Design a protein around this ligand. Structure first.
Ligand code: A1EKN
Ligand code: A1EKN
Lengths: 105, 105
């Protein structure tokens, strides 16, 4: 169904994150106080399961989570950091990838 | 190409580092003061080129670089950190992989 289209989009984005910083949830162990600051955590790992269980109706629900993942990254980490810089790149990239016009292909 | 047992050893270790923390040089941007503390930096990226140019004579030359990479990691980073813990895992793994007895094969 539309699950297949999301898996195409997901694999496009996972490839843009070669070091897998967005691969499973961030822990307080590696990110002090992450759980207190980000109350809506999101990751490709979580977005994979939600395609496996067809819990995505629209594209717009998928990109909502995708944006939440990048906003979390740009909210917890300083602009100086690898996690911030990669978040902004991936956010702007995915939005042009899953856009109104490019969806017509 | 007689020396490809190094490439066997290398790809065993690279796979133990899925996030690719040992894949190219650490920068002071990512690691404050790295250049001051570690004067002999080493990485799989550097070790790949040195197989491409067959600059490794013995196994013991390869393990020497391998050890330097892990000892750098266990010198610069605190025990608490993911880079330290992965260094000690890879160190104990490579030592059993490239050991006195297993070198018979
Ligand atoms: C998805 O797995 C990881 C994520 C991050 C990571 C990701 C992020 C983000 C997305 O904010 N982050 C923020 C501060 C500190 C670390 C991180 C950093 C990581 O290693 C430095 C890893 C890989 N990891 C986790 C546990 N062992 C390895
Ligand atoms: C090979 O690329 C990386 C290496 C490390 C990393 C590796 C190490 C080591 C092994 O000491 N290290 C020590 C302190 C802080 C970071 C690191 C951490 C990384 O991201 C958090 C990255 C990935 N990276 C670098 C620039 N863009 C992505």
């Amino acid at each position: 169904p539309i699950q297949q289209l999301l898996e195409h989009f997901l694999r496009q984005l996972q490839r843009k994150d070669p070091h897998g910083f967005f691969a499973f949830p961030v822990t307080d162990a590696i990110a002090p106080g992450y759980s207190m600051i980000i109350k809506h955590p999101m990751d490709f790992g979580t977005m994979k399961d939600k395609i496996v269980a067809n819990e995505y109706k629209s594209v717009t629900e998928f990109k909502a989570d995708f944006k939440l993942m990048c906003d979390n990254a740009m909210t917890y980490n300083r602009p100086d950091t690898v996690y911030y810089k990669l978040a902004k790149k991936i956010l702007h990239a995915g939005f042009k990838m899953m856009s109104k016009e490019r969806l017509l292909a």
